[PDB]
Structure formats: C-alpha cells, structure tokens
Amino acid sequence: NFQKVEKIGEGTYGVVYKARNKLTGEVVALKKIRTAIREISLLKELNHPNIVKLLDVIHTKLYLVFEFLHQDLKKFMDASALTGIPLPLIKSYLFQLLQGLAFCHSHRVLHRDLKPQNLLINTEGAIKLADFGLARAFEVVTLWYRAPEILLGCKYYSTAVDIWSLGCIFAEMVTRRALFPGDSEIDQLFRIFRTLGTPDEVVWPGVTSMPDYKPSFPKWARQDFSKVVPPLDEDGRSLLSQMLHYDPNKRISAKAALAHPFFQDVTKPVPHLRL
Numbered sequence: 007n008f009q010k011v012e013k014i015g016e017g018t019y020g021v022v023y024k025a026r027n028k029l030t031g032e033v034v035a036l037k038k039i040r041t042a043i044r045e046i047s048l049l050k051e052l053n054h055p056n057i058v059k060l061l062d063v064i065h066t067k068l069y070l071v072f073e074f075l076h077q078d079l080k081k082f083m084d085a086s087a088l089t090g091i092p093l094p095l096i097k098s099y100l101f102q103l104l105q106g107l108a109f110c111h112s113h114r115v116l117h118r119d120l121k122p123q124n125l126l127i128n129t130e131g132a133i134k135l136a137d138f139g140l141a142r143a144f145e146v147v148t149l150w151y152r153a154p155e156i157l158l159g160c161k162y163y164s165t166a167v168d169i170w171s172l173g174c175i176f177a178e179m180v181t182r183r184a185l186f187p188g189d190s191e192i193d194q195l196f197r198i199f200r201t202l203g204t205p206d207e208v209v210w211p212g213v214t215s216m217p218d219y220k221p222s223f224p225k226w227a228r229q230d231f232s233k234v235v236p237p238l239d240e241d242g243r244s245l246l247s248q249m250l251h252y253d254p255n256k257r258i259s260a261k262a263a264l265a266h267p268f269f270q271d272v273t274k275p276v277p278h279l280r281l
C-alpha cells in the first residue's frame with residue numbers, strides 16, 4: 007500500500023488513520039468508508055480555512071485522504087475540564103465554526119453530525135469542521151447534539167440542524183458539561199424538553215404535526231438560560247438562545263450569528279496544546 011498507518015478514531019461513516027505517504031513523506035489522515043463519487047470530488051477545490059481539506063478520493067472500498075490536525079475539541083475540552091477553556095478562545099472557536107458553517111451552508115452542504123470529536127484544532131488557533139455526514143447525503147451513536155426536528159422525524163431538515171449542534175457545543179465549552187446528554191432518541195428529546203420546555207404551536211408552528219410528535223408527550227415548563235449556562239454573559243446567552251430556538255425557521259443562521267454583538271470583541275488566541 008502507499009502509506010504507513012495508525013488508528014486515531016471512528017467517524018460516523020468510517021475509521022480514521024494517521025498515515026505517512028511512503029514516497030512524499032506527507033503526514034495525512036485516511037478515512038476508510040464501507041454518481042456520489044462526483045460531488046464529493048468537487049469538495050477538493052471548495053476550500054475554507056475552517057473546513058478540513060480533502061486531499062484525495064479513492065474507490066475500490068472508499069478512501070478519503072485529509073489534511074492532518076493535531077488535536078480534536080473533545081480531547082481539548084477534557085484536558086481543560088479542571089480550569090475551563092478561556093472565554094476568548096471559546097469565542098474565537100465559535101466564530102470560526104460559524105464561518106465554516108456559513109461557507110458550507112452557502113454551498114448547500116449540511117454537516118448533520120457536529121460534535122466535539124469532529125472539530126479539529128491546531129497550534130495556531132484554528133478550528134475546522136470534519137466528519138461531514140456526506141455519505142448518506144450522497145460504536146454507540148451520540149445523540150447529544152441532534153436537533154429536535156431530526157428527533158421528531160422531519161425528513162427534509164435544513165442547515166438549521168447544524169446551528170443547533172453548534173449551540174449545544176458552545177454551551178458545553180462554557181459549562182464543562184454536556185447540555186443534553188441523552189442515551190436514546192426519546193430520552194434525548196425529553197432532555198431537551200425538560201430544559202427548554204415542551205414545544206407547542208406557539209413557539210414552533212407545526213410541531214404537533216411532526217411525524218413522531220405524540221400529543222401524549224409530557225408538558226414541561228421552560229427554565230431560564232440563566233440556569234442553563236450560568237457563567238456565560240448576557241451577549242453569549244442571547245446568541246445561544248437564538249441558536250437553540252425550537253423552530254428551525256426562527257433559529258439564527260450562521261451568517262446572522264456572525265454579526266451578533268457577542269463577537270464585537272472577538273480575537274484569535276492561541277490554545278495551550280499538549281501533543
């Protein structure tokens with residue numbers, strides 16, 4: 007084979023290896039997965055600083071060669087759990103991720119499975135989206151970041167599902183605890199309901215006609231964001247509240263989120279990375 011190879015983890019659609027090109031010496035990441043071959047390959051020339059670069063596509067069964075990043079945000083959050091990630095770095099990372107989402111959404115590409123392990127960081131302060139759910143689009147599953155319209159059975163969900171996931175990640179960076187740590191689809195939905203209130207037609211028109219909506223759902227009252235992400239200042243809570251709107255049509259877009267006052271003082275700090 008063309009590479010020398012070491013496992014780094016499991017994406018949603020296949021296993022990921024750190025590897026060195028035998029002839030070139032390039033250090034890269036290889037994802038092994040298992041027409042569509044087409045639109046994936048366009049993504050080689052659609053590049054953004056906050057999206058992981060796809061280097062090559064190879065089919066026998068399907069290999070994807072990516073640039074290599076040195077840490078993922080789950081490991082970085084775990085490493086930072088005793089002290090917390092500094093607010094300026096949280097804010098820089100959120101801003102960068104919204105830039106990546108604005109870009110891919112503007113090209114009508116959804117991610118669909120944002121989670122801390124899929125967000126990759128380097129020593130220079132960048133963070134990049136990875137592990138796009140693009141294989142269906144063209145070992146226990148984590149539901150903690152799933153938008154409620156997905157859980158309620160919406161077939162044709164939108165770019166808003168990514169804003170929801172990013173909102174959950176934002177909250178988790180701030181509080182150092184997962185916002186909605188469910189272990190089943192209904193447990194995930196009811197954890198969301200218990201925190202944000204059971205949605206109704208007032209806050210989410212059409213929710214009661216969603217495929218998996220049940221009139222027998224318990225009706226929980228909404229608690230206040232002061233309780234949900236206490237340390238976060240009012241600008242951060244306002245932005246988070248707009249990222250976690252039940253109605254996908256009221257939920258803030260990535261482009262709109264970038265203009266939120268929370269980012270008026272955004273900067274690009276350097277993380278303390280132990281590699």
Ligand SMILES: CCc1cnn2c(NCc3ccc[n+](O)c3)cc(N3CCCC[C@H]3CCO)nc12
Binds near residue numbers: 016036072125
């Ligand atoms: C795009 C392919 C890729 C490139 N770098 N990289 C990294 N680098 C960080 C890193 C390096 C060395 C050891 N560790 O533990 C982390 C991790 C990672 N992933 C996290 C773990 C689950 C699989 C996979 C998901 C997201 O692609 N995927 C990638």
Ligand SMILES: O=C(O)c1cc([N+](=O)[O-])ccc1NCCc1c[nH]c2ccccc12
Binds near residue numbers: 017037059070115136
């Ligand atoms: O990230 C993955 O694992 C992944 C998986 C599959 N797949 O499984 O078919 C396909 C593509 C993937 N990444 C592409 C990253 C990418 C480069 N330029 C872009 C421009 C817009 C949106 C995204 C990108």
